Amino acid sequence: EFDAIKIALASPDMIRSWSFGEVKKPETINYRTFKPERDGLFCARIFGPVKDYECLCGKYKRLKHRGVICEKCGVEVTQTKVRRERMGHIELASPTAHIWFLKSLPSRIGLLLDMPLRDIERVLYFESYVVIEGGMTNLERQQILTEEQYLDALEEFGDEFDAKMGAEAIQALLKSMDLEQECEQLREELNETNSETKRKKLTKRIKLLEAFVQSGNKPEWMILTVLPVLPPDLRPLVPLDGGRFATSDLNDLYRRVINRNNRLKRLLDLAAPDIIVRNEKRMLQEAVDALLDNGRRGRAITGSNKRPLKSLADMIKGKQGRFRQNLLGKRVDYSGRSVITVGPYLRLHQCGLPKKMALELFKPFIYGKLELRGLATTIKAAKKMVEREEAVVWDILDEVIREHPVLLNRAPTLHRLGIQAFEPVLIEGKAIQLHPLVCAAYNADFDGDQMAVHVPLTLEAQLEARALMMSTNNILSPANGEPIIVPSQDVVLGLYYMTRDCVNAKGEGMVLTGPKEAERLYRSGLASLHARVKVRITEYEKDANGELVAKTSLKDTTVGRAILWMIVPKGLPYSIVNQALGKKAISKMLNTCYRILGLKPTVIFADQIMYTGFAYAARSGASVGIDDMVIPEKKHEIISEAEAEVAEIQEQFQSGLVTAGERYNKVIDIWAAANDRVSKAMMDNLQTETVINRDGQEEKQVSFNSIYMMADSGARGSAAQIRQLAGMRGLMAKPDGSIIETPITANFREGLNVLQYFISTHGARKGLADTALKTANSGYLTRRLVDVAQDLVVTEDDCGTHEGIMMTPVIEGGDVKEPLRDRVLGRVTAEDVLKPGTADILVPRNTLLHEQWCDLLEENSVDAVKVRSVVSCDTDFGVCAHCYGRDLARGHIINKGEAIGVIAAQSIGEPGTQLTMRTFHIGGAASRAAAESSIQVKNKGSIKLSNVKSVVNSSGKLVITSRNTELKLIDEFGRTKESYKVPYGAVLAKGDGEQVAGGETVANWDPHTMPVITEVSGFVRFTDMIDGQTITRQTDELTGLSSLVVLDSAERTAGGKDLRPALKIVDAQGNDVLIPGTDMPAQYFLPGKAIVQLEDGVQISSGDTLARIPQESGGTKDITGGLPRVADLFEARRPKEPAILAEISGIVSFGKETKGKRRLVITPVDGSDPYEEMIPKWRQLNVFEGERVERGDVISDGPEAPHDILRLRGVHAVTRYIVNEVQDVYRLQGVKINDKHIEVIVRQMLRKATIVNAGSSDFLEGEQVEYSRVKIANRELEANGKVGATYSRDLLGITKASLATESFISAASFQETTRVLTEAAVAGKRDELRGLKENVIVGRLIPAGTGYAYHQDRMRRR
Amino acid sequence: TASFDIEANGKVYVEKGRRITARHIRQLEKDDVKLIEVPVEYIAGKVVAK
Amino acid sequence: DQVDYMDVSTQQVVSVGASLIPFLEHDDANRALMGANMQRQAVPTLRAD
DNA sequence: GCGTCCTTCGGAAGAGATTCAGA
DNA sequence: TCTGAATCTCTTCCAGCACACATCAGGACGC
RNA sequence: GAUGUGUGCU
């Protein structure tokens, strides 16, 4: 049919070609017999007939007159459907300006003529004249003349000189423009001028002129002459109940425009005075402006109720526009909706539909089978029989509903598992029964939520629902390798209560020959479910190549585990149920069942776990009483100790030792420590305090308190909720993220005061107002993440390269948060990995390492695997299967032709939204850690201190004087095992090389107020610190000691902003001291809030504190407050203080001194040395005048900006930095996201690449073009005798890179529809319909999944 | 901070460069003096009212 | 000796809707807000009890 | 009952236009 | 006095689905 | 068809 969409400007000849008539009167339906008016916005002569195959006046009535045009009213008799296809047009008496090319910012008229926007809007809205054809005078071709100046110009130069005004003047300016001469003149100016800002402006105007001269467009078409009208059927005036009509916005706007045009034409026909026609031209221009894009001008007009009405742009742009409301998503027939109930008698491939919903859903199917069997005769007879709900219809419904899967769907569909396909089971009632095993995936609690059903009509839809979207084949979440059908909240409790032991029973020491006799014992009640017996079991093993070899043993187990073994499929080792099965235990059990056996045994076993959990949970009676939450008898001692310590803090801050912010930072510290102590004390008292006799003296066992069962099993609960049920509730947070200074001291089991409840109200409102008002900026994240990765789809089997990111197991301050196994699993290695059996390879070059390979890598203790990443793939418009890895939902390599960009974006974007609508579940607790200020190393081994600049203290111990340090603990083998981050100004009791014993303390510091320290001792002189101007100095009269606080750049005096406080070190003679290594003075700069408690010229020791600066480490650190960081990383925001790097290698030295600020020059020893850099005096330099620096080394300190790290350290370093930071952010809240999705997003970041030099390619010098195009052009040129064009990868944010996508329809549908549509119309772009959203809008097979083969056939056919 | 040598009735009250602590204000109230000398360069940072 | 005013009753903090919940001082306010709302949304039965 | 008509109040960020300073 | 860096100013965006109720559609002035 | 208010689940 078609394979492209072209967008360009509209010519008046082309609009008249679109035009079928000339509307010139604002007459809608005549408030009478409802006929269209003669020459109004609705008319049969202009657009088309009202009723089908009928004339307007009534001269023809049926199809036998089709084609003829009537005589009395001049209308044609044709279909009535063409009223939404046949456009009219308006012949404006005077031209007008189209605002989209006027106020886009960049204003196309503004930079096309190089005259500012203000002058153009003054000219186009009649406040000043403008000059055309200056001629033989001093007036230029673009000069602006006011009224008085224009009058002067006419009284002195009233010759053939012309000076028009308004839209006519602008039209003359654009028509009298020569594109080639301007283009070559600007090219000459670009070649001549050396300044960069004028160069950028000139090259932007050159780009615009090249866009004009390339396409068939011309500059004069941007001023509107004829105004086409929308077809009447798309602006209907529905006849309401009575004589009034609908207040359709477009009709009123067209009425106003036609009013202005007709009045202007009448005034121009009568030769009105020039001021009146000028004012009426202004009115016409503003009316057309309000019709085209209302609200872009100063005031948006309103029709009624003082409400800004919508124009032709408000229904194309925004959240309520056609792109997001009626194109990317539509209301769908054959659908239903009802409240859901449990019905746990179902299976994974079954759902429950109400008997009445299925009769309305599958109604055409019933009609078809009723016509097939001959029970009915025609369609209307079957319709009447269905409406009468005869008994035969109910019988035949069970026939159509048999194996026709439906789409169960919830309202918020966060991820891929929001739509699953089930077979229906017809039941009575009006509720959609749902299988609870998928309720965790759905996040569909049974508290009154509505799900939506959908009926696959065509054959392919049913087969896709059977083979792809079926819930049986969706038991692995796309986020990670963990299963998504995890039993929860009843089955976990049942299994945990069953698979448990206590030392007593009805029968304990007896012996059984298998699970069957254990069941016989438990059913008869001759042995308790928690006995400790020795049954004889027959577990199977598959050591052979797919054959199960038998073995029989006599293991010491319980009765419950023996019963549970009856449902375990043949092939798993018995050492999976011989414990207390919690939630993670059975999750791992299901995972290993899937990994070993497959899919059908896994689903059958999951259903069996469901059944045997529900039955033995019903039989358990695991209730909850008020006698189950036991209050520990030592929590009030802990609150007394914390009260004493905070009373000490009172004296600490009121004296002046610490300030208000520091007091607030320490009080939260001590309250959190007390809360963590009370929680642990209560947990111990509630899990171990039970007494039982084994037929003799008393023995201790794991407690059987109900709350402990449902807090240890993990069915539903954690430490927070139960901790708040007994003992200490803790300290809660305000909606802004700040934490309350006073934690309420009471628990819900004993009660709350009338004031502690008021305090907990803060956290309770925080949770709710955080969910409902900050899940918006987390749904926005996933929206603009799915947008940026929609067009990325697997396209090739193998790209065949050797490039790949370097993969290491990360230890960022604690234990091993994630090992190698959890990190590299299911990803194809990039090269032959070297085991520590060196000179021999362990795993081949291109094997997708599965769980067995992961175990092999864990066995040989390998710590450095080069793995293929999706960001380093070499394919074109997609990524090969080998650079991605496994499907993450199936146990195999991914199939070529699958949309992984969408599953990556959804996986990244819905832990944030999900968990931010979960912060109210724990109540309102801050959940802030204790902020430990010491290092207790546990493992035995040595220390490898990397990049540490330590100095000697007055006590002699090492003190760190660097910011990027990390203390790594490495065991005796030499492999890395631990790594801790020591802070600035921390003292070390140990060093490097010494084998540190396990269980000592090596580093100490103070958590708040990290101190600036000195290298060399001596006397300090108070330089550039005068009281009041830049420092607030307070002094006690009696003692006479200065404890000052410095000012910021905020509250300091405006004149004194050039005064920068610092402490300079001098000797006894006041001479200059030097840093060890260089001859530069010790100028230690002071930041804001720096407190100093010293005196000028005091004797100190080397390596001591000088000043303290508060850190203000305050925040709840939830996913609600704590994830703008992910948005900053993905949109690539430049940090406030970027740490300057070394852009080229070579020796480092200074050049000129104080060119306003410091200067530095890097010179290589072989190549050219044109690199200079500007260094503000804010940051000290970690390098000196006499070392050698390499590319990527940090000259100063601070956060890295995700532009320079890419441009200097390469793609791998920046992608690893982004991956690590996002992974740490998500793992702070326990989320487990596979890194592949993040790498997919980072690859989608890097699509733009600016050209360094043209080379032999056809691209320009500074033009920014797709990296895929550059790679293809370079590969094509390298096949010939030419040379490729050197480039550099850019890094634009997800929003920036999405808005500059090659297919303009995606960007137009996403955001800034006006600014993108105008650019696409100016440039004359041509969409290829390559991605997914474009084919969604068009309505074809998306080239993503099952339609990928069809798209390949359609592409290769041409 | 005293930009010059603060003095009154001939005798010097606050030396140059020294800040005017509250004891200095109290002692100047006790001495009951209002007329002081000043270099004309200090008038540069002043603005005329009418 | 320093006080000069005292609250009339404990019930004055909460509204009329939220005061009808018994044992409100043991429920978390998060599950008291929704409790008050769903007490606001109740339907009258046949034989009131 | 007919019938025709001329208030302010967000805020986080990006971009494009000014001002500054500074050598 | 030209030209980068800093600041001023204008525009864009802000979750999804569903349900219930109401009004409203020129309303002012002449006939 | 659009606005206004209230409400449910996230």
Ligand SMILES: [Mg+2]
């Ligand atoms: Mg819910």
Ligand SMILES: [Zn+2]
């Ligand atoms: Zn006719």
Ligand SMILES: [Zn+2]
């Ligand atoms: Zn590849």
